[PDB]
Amino acid sequence: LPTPHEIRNHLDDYVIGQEQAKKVLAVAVYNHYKRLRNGDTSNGVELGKSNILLIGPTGSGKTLLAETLARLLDVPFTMADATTLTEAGYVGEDVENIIQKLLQKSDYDVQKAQRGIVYIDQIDKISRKSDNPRDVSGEGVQQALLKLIEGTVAAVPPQGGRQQEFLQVDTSKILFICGGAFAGLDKVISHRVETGSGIGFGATVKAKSDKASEGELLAQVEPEDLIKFGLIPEFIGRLPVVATLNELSEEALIQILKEPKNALTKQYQALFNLEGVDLEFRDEALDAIAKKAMARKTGARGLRSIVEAALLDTMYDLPSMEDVEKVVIDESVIDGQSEPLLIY
């Protein structure tokens, strides 16, 4: 049933700018389900576990891929958070609660829940930082999660009980997608491999050029680098598949403002349409916006700041203004040097 060719096209409809990442997920997703079709029946013994490790910058679409995949996929999907997770459940939460929410989506169907997908956001949150210690969000969380990720049956009261019984739902079959933004990881990889600082005439020095630090550096990531970050090596050993996402290109940004149905121009113009005046954006403004956005280095999430701040003056006085049929925005408006000219 799974198709790697079609799934890549489907993700392209909702995600843009990450072509390599789509290929990685299609292989792991196809392999994981194919394994369950014939479980441990092949001649090959000790088959490696198929897991996913999403790693990319902010606004790269980590949370977006989990949403799009859930809609396209038939099995139930869940969206949890690592910040809420706590060890030995004092007042925050428990690891077993993740399984309870999965059944609510699957309507207490063990046969249908074991084939489900799991996605945990902000994986970096559980990084073990116990230099000055007890720790409820550090080693305790990762230790409990590793036990679950290893594959074990955990007691879960079905429906809560009206019984003193619990179901032994398997865990090795269920898939897991550990993803989150890694801050400081680039420095760790750069610290290990620099291959520079040559003072000789023959030697070369690169101060601004960083050999595509946003994308190339991620491609050369190793498990040993994450160990210094705080993660446990056994946790990384269980995830042979890692996804690397490069920084969005200026071309990709333009596509994100036009092709998607959640585009800023579409919603903002729709909002202006309610007022009664149409909104027009030229192509020259779009490429200009992309350059400013990349400078901020905030991702797509910070794109809105440039568009809104530029239109702050226009929206403030637009209701008072009358007899304006359409609004025209030029490239200079993005810079802010020239005010936009209205159409009557």
Next chain:
Amino acid sequence: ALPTPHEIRNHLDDYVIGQEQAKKVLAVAVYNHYKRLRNGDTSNGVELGKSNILLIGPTGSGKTLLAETLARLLDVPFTMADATTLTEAGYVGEDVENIIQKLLQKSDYDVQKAQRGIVYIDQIDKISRKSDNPSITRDVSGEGVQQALLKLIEGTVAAVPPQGQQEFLQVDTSKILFICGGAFAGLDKVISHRVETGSGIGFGATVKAKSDKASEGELLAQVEPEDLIKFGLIPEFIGRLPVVATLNELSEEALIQILKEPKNALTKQYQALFNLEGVDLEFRDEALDAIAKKAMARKTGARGLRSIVEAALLDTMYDLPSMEDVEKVVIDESVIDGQSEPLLIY
């Protein structure tokens, strides 16, 4: 109908002065919020976006005043929370969810009426890391609460105790506004590092300070999201707040206007205090400007102005009750210096 940006700003002008740049920002959000709440999830463009404001300004610039005045004219519910007590990872003290439970007291347990509410936070700068990207000891209000808040702004549902069965309710935050703003301390040093680019020793090294450069207002205006990363904020948290408002330091003229034009101007408050005693209080124009000059030297903002007035009239306030048959009291510019005593009218 809904209020217009010009109409709401005319109301804010009575309580706020010299912050034109900030009044327009709050006006568009309120206008956008009502427009978002005007249509019943029906629009030409689906998935209407949410914009979060980040109020940044000097000390005593009027940030806390705007959130208070906004709730008076705002019809929808409003809450005034604080980031001081936020406890990430469920430690002792208040939790992020509390902000939502507090929003029901003003809304009187109305979920449909609560999702259309506005939220304001203060002292958001205080929860930033100490100019270090990696946290060594898992800061509860550093690398903690900042992350915890991400889920709420992004849009999720959190269980809240209905009363003080014991079942909980779910309320989404995807269509709830949040105004997180606080006076950042030491931000000027970071901005100077990235924009002055003239440090060093030499004939051709541009080094001119304490006279022209290092202006508080100019530095804040040139702020960018990349600058906050060196300060301690996480980029994820900054991504959820695209809008940014840069307030300025109160000018000498602004102080004079704030002394008389506001409804609750300090000059009027003291007159009310003196009015009940039975003695009128008048301030001569010349005297008012002198007080403004002293306030700027203190570098404490509008709040510091009370100190100057209190000291100037400290002696008169002590002797006014024991004195009798006094109709009017006039304060002169010399009285502010303290060399002379204000005249009295019998």
Next chain:
Amino acid sequence: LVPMVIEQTSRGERSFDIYSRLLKERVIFLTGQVEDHMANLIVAQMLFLEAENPEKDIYLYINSPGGVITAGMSIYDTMQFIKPDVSTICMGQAASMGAFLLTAGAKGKRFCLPNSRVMIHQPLGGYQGQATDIEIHAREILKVKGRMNELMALHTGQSLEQIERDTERDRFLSAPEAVEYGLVDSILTHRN
């Protein structure tokens, strides 16, 4: 030998040399003949103090019998380029170039000791070679003499004709006469 001193600080004790200790307080010493090496060291000191604090006055103590002219003109332009007021003081003696840097200090911040002495004369030189080369070097040194008199009048306030007549030969001026001549502002007899 140079003695070593100890500066008490909040962090801890630090051993500094006498010359370096005073440099921290915006104090520079001009000793011996004026040459290219000693002059290049003072220029770095002035620039270093400018960056540390551009609003604090600098103090320059001069005790030297003079020297090369080109080495001294670098110090004059440096004092005027930097915003801080370079205070000058005369200790022991002030020769042709030593006197020019003394009077070049900030107006109102120039002092002379009660027993100090200033000497001023015309530039010295010489050359050996063809007659054509002597004319070239003679016109050059004449330009310097004219240039040095113009600047001397600017700071001292006297007329250009008076400085020329007074600098034709060696002219010694006591500390009181220097005040009347506009070369200095006052005398630092005692501490107040």
Next chain:
Amino acid sequence: XXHXXXX
């Protein structure tokens, strides 16, 4: 309740 660790 909470945890304290520094030096």
